[model samples]
Target chain A: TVEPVLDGPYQPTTFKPPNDYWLLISSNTNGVVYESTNNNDFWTAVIAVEPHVSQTNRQYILFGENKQFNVENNSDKWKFFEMFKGSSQGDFSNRRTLTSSNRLVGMLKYGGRVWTFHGETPRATTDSSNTADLNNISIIIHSEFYIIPRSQESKCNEYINNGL
Target chain B: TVEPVLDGPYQPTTFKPPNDYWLLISSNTNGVVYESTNNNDFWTAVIAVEPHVSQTNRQYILFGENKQFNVENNSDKWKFFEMFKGSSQGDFSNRRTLTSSNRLVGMLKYGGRVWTFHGETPRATTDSSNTADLNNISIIIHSEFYIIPRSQESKCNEYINNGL
Candidate 1:
């Protein structure tokens, strides 16, 4: 809902369901992968209630992504910490971003007890071409959150991964 | 919702709310503290969507607690990972228990890739004395999950902490 659809229907709103899995695809790429997604595309995630550590509230959630394409292993492949400021209706700003290393990349909101980032600061660069990759996934953060049911997980995965 | 209360109504079902919090109090002890809960009562939590680290899914939730009695800081004082097997309406066995140290004391269901647990195994006894301490908070896990609203957070905290 952040970016209004150009000459299209009302921009579909995304609630970012808590404790539920979603195929977090980018509006432009429709995948969280670099260049394209299919082989190693991490397409699944839950807008978790709490962060990995150092957080002390329900305001922040773990944005974990998994490769839904692999039928044998459909689980979280990677994760990050994102501070959620949306109401029950969804729609909010970045607020903060924490990579798997638990790095803090935004201002702290609601003010809770915090922990130190583990690894070095993550790399970020202004994109002139807007190519999506693991480190350069600005589109994933601002994405379309579609709920993926248990029954439709594989199907959703296939669709996101550009499968048969 | 686990324990059937003697001569009580429908056991007053406790549906561990996702992304939301409850004043997690023990049935007998009415607290997750050593003996009683007041000054240092960890009285809040969210049946979060994911664990600190390890396996993945919407099945598990973070069961955190806080000294709700504290006004200046009512954030999560302590936290643990709990594997959930509940439906949309809630109610399920704590399929697994993960202490703050990320120790596992239950079997892994649904079978996701997991990580090694940290710290030594936790302490447990027959509990002839029936005392409630930090390391011995059995009753808190199996108690009610009353939803706490932001407006009534302090009031609920007071009641859970045995207010003056």
Candidate 2:
């Protein structure tokens, strides 16, 4: 069993199961979770994969409650996209705050082809104190993945939506 | 560990995992899978949950190549909604063939609320000679679920689309 190495904000850890896939979850909120293997393909294609059109088109979900933005009066909503950086090889400070309209979370190559997760929608706020509903967004991404063929170029939205 | 009991067509079975949650998969297809416990909630509310608007919005993926229609020429695109009757308390033959526009596959109660998967479109036909392209339909659905709170009732397009 590979123990999770605590790192960065929100104390995110890398946990490896004995004979199963890597299941990443938050200690703070038991429900927020992610899964993948220790294989190198998932990490290499992380940066290369782009945003997708629909939530069903994507393949992972990143959830956390932490502030990483450098803006003044940054509310809890800033935490939404901060955890997003952990899924990629890119820099967190260089990342911009994602718009509410964009369903994209992140992408990677797991089994064979590159896949991604598109945000379905934000769920109801967890707490009632804050007037803004952006604080606690419950994101849902697809568990399914799109298989990018050998000859085809990897485009986030370039998967078969209707037929093969 | 609870071995899945082979119930009906599509070989729907109940699979219990050790730690995280129950996983239901069919040997018939690589992508056709489901997850739930041996608990009664999963089977009890499977029929009560209605259809969802977006494919990502729902929670199950149902697919089969068999032709259920009595029409003289049934296309390869049967879009298996027939197995859905297996989830309910009534007879399987009484189930209706769903319209193509709807995103709902089937529904069940997991973790105290009704959950479901939306059908991802089928892949393009392998050969152009056959007019219908449904053989290699790699359907995808969201593993994540949304709890329809006590205050909220089920509807086709009802849900918090943005933030709380």
Candidate 3:
């Protein structure tokens, strides 16, 4: 029998684990987080709202894939998309182009016209681009988010310097 | 080597096939359709709007799972949730209780109080439960649906006789 593949997310292909266990934060197309079993070989899917930060460069970066997100500061590719638990031989091609073509981040934050605090139909402005501005955002109640910590503030600032 | 399990959705376990090949319409928890490769044993996920039928009985019977949904008409159990690929061991317990505890259909049509077409701050109505009445459902534009076919009218009527 063929050995099953390990498509589970891992540390950056180029970055070594700091010590022993590696910790990674990731979400799926459903914008849900993933939880692994205590076992060393498998995982289960978990659903949740994705909390991501957008940038002025139009780069909607999330942590799971490092790529250029931290390329300027370091040399590791993080090779974000290379992590997975299945063969890339078939319909799984999306695994490769998640960031570039499919724009996973863009889709996760799917939008609609009815977004507003006290938005009234035919009356409220259309949030065509999801300019809901959660910071100054209204009505889409689920737009709740948290700010980065003072310690990580520098990294957060770099990502959202141009954002609201 | 161990032979992998066939977890793909199959025709009702108790219902014998009609001919050489069988046709089944099913979707995944993502409310997405599943497309099998032209091969013998694998599937891929396809995202879309779930055109489900709800009943006044709140039966919420979906095609893939047919236990009491058709027990009255025949002497078979579709055993809906049991039709999966992996071992029932570990965290997969939900596979069995999917229809009962989790309420698959209800969760699929998840709702928020803010659901409405020309809805305003306070909302057109709480629509607390997705009582949006898609047939009469206004706004939330994605509520499009097609009626069951004339040939299949009997089945459709029985299922939704109590619905709007």
Writing each residue's lDDT as its tens digit, candidate 2 over A1-164 gives: 99433221223333332211111111211112233322221221111121332121222222221111222312222122323332334433312222222222333332333233322224211111111222122223222222232233223222211111
Worst 10 residues of 1 chain B by lDDT: B107-116
Q: Model 3 segments beyond 4 Å from truth?
A: A1-136, A139-144, A148-155, A159-164, B1-82, B86-164
- Candidate 1 per-residue lDDT, tens place, A18-48, comes to 2223333324321222111111222222232
User: Candidate 2 or 3, higher lDDT?
Assistant: 2
TM-score of each: 0.20, 0.22, 0.19
Each candidate's interface RMSD, rounded to one decimal? 11.0, 12.2, 23.6
The digit string of per-residue lDDT tens for model 2 on B44-133 reads 112112233223223333322222322221333223232233232332241223222222243333333333332323211110111121
Scored by CA lDDT, what does every candidate get? Answer: 0.25, 0.25, 0.21
lDDT, candidate 3, B49-155, per-residue tens: 22232321212212222222211112121112221122112111112211211111111112221110111111111122223222211111111122232344333
TM-score of 2: 0.22
- Candidates 1 and 2: which is better by TM-score? 2
Query: Could you tell me which residue pairs clash in candidate 1?
Result: A34-A133, B34-B132, B34-B133, B48-B61, B48-B62
Model 1's CAPRI class? Answer: incorrect
lDDT of 3: 0.21
